[PDB]
Ligand binder design. Structure first.
Ligand SMILES: C=C(C)CCOP(=O)(O)OP(=O)(O)O
Ligand SMILES: C=C(C)CCOP(=O)(O)OP(=O)(O)O
Ligand SMILES: C=C(C)CCOP(=O)(O)OP(=O)(O)O
Ligand SMILES: C=C(C)CCOP(=O)(O)OP(=O)(O)O
Ligand SMILES: [Mg+2]
Ligand SMILES: [Mg+2]
Ligand SMILES: [Mg+2]
Ligand SMILES: [Mg+2]
Lengths: 288, 301
């Protein structure tokens, strides 16, 4: 019965959770937090009050960091923002569970934005829609890469993947703000802006290496230049090169000279770097 | 072509949908006792939700539950789930995590298909949000104790709080969504919390008893019997046996004989197996000594 009492008390109450518990399981998240402007700027138009703007800000921050914690496990990444990734320190189990926990903490914050039911429902749909989009994008990035060469994407498939994957959070942010604003949409603009951002991330991962980690190569990522290279070689009948690009991706190698060979193939043999640099310029042009 | 791309919603073919769904379909094809699904139909005898809402609640629960197991198997380095290879060993940890997470959000999406009524809708989202937060808290504690061992040896009380969060979470999510949708005029949450607790201690018990592959040992999990053995040896200054329990859990061993040795210690030295069997019977007695529901539990004794 002394036991009966405690059980009775246990089951008749909300689950017990302390501030110490909160701290112990937030470790992976506090670590990446150790490593926006766009929102402040975009507000000039949206015109959201400050405390509301700060909530949008906390929300995208939780979602952005959480998704990187997961992405780094997915991409076997050793470094993020110059430091060791959380999963290498705290382990994959803790990191995944904490990142997932923060997605739900983020969701909780949405209700602090409003109570107006029409509005709230729309804010939730936005949150739910773009998170679904991010996972669809991520899922293809990962599938193409881990099942290569089962599927060789075309430039169009890559752009659609990116629209899902990178576009998700850019669209989530803008859409939360548009819907909260007293008042055409900026979604197509944010879309092009995310496509650019992603292709540039892809490009810079290789070019900063060619001039002075090229980790995407160790990941085996179907980046924008790799996708161009793989379709170019197939289209020009460069069988040997097409296969060698496939083989180096599949090695998941950290060897610097092997990574450099691939980058120089993209440089001189397929011209993918130039093509990618140009492509970025043209998209940036569509705004100029 | 750019214009048309950025002025449309992102593309998603049913073919893509099918690619991403594989890790999930993989676990879906290996059944279970459908325990939660069955519990739902029963309880609806008293909740009386219209059949369509009952289908949606069941689906949300099925998605949450199966995805949660896909992820738990990654967190637990599990080679088998429901007598079949785990999804992360086939499609890899990366796709498996992403797909499980994707399904959490597809379960969320189904919540707005439950109701138009914006007042009711707010509460359903809150229920969904709160129990997913609770599920992750219990799971984070279970993982923390295991991966930081021997930094913190949980007490029986801490274990029970961890279980109320971890296993009680989806049981409470199920019941609360239904009490909230019920057109019918106390609550079953306390009952569903006890069930959850029984259910988890029994899982921990069965993983060691059916052996005595006792994967919980390989995992190094702070299961109920193990929590009992460590707190016991600890209480009676049994330094050496306590340390040995700790050494075997820390080996993360797949050794049949070493696993056997630890089971032997819990059986013959701390007597944790019988302690757990008796603890489960007492929790069942609280219920059965307080109707389809009445059977269900007895079934768990
Ligand atoms: C914001 C999200 C979820 C996309 C991250 O994908 P990537 O793997 O392409 O991004 P990086 O690791 O290069 O930052
Ligand atoms: C959104 C993508 C593609 C990955 C993260 O990019 P960022 O370079 O913006 O990541 P942080 O600056 O926050 O490290
Ligand atoms: C103890 C928990 C919560 C995980 C296993 O649940 P089940 O044992 O009900 O799994 P399935 O029957 O669906 O395989
Ligand atoms: C899957 C969730 C959310 C709780 C059960 O985790 P456990 O690791 O204790 O369950 P089993 O693997 O024994 O099924
Ligand atoms: Mg990455
Ligand atoms: Mg990635
Ligand atoms: Mg497990
Ligand atoms: Mg587990």
């Amino acid at each position: 019965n002394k036991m009966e009492a405690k059980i009775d008390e246990l089951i008749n109450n909300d689950p017990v959770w302390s501030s110490q518990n909160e701290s112990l399981i937030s470790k992976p998240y506090n670590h990446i937090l150790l490593k926006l402007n766009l929102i402040v700027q975009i507000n000039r138009v949206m015109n959201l009050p400050k405390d509301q703007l700060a909530i949008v800000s906390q929300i995208v921050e939780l979602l952005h960091n959480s998704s990187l914690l997961i992405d780094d496990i997915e991409d076997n990444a050793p470094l993020r923002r110059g430091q060791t990734t959380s999963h290498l320190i705290f382990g994959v189990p803790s990191t995944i569970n904490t990142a997932n926990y923060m997605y739900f903490r983020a969701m909780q914050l949405v209700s602090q934005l409003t109570t107006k039911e029409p509005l709230y429902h729309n804010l939730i749909t936005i949150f739910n829609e773009e998170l679904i989009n991010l996972h669809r994008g991520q899922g293809l990035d990962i599938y193409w890469r881990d099942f290569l060469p089962e599927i060789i994407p075309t430039q169009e498939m890559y752009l659609n993947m990116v629209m899902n994957k990178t576009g998700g959070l850019f669209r989530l942010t803008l859409r939360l703000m548009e819907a909260l604003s007293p008042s055409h949409s900026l979604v197509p603009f944010i879309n092009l802006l995310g496509i650019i951002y992603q292709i540039r991330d892809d490009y810079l991962n290789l070019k900063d290496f060619q001039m002075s980690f090229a980790e995407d190569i160790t990941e085996g990522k179907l980046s924008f230049p790799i996708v161009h290279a793989l379709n170019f070689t197939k289209t020009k009948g460069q069988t040997e090169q097409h296969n060698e690009i496939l083989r180096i991706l599949l090695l998941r190698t950290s060897d610097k000279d092997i990574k450099l060979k691939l980058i120089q193939i993209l440089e001189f043999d397929t011209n993918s770097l130039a093509y990618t640099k140009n492509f970025i310029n043209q998209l940036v042009n569509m705004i100029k």
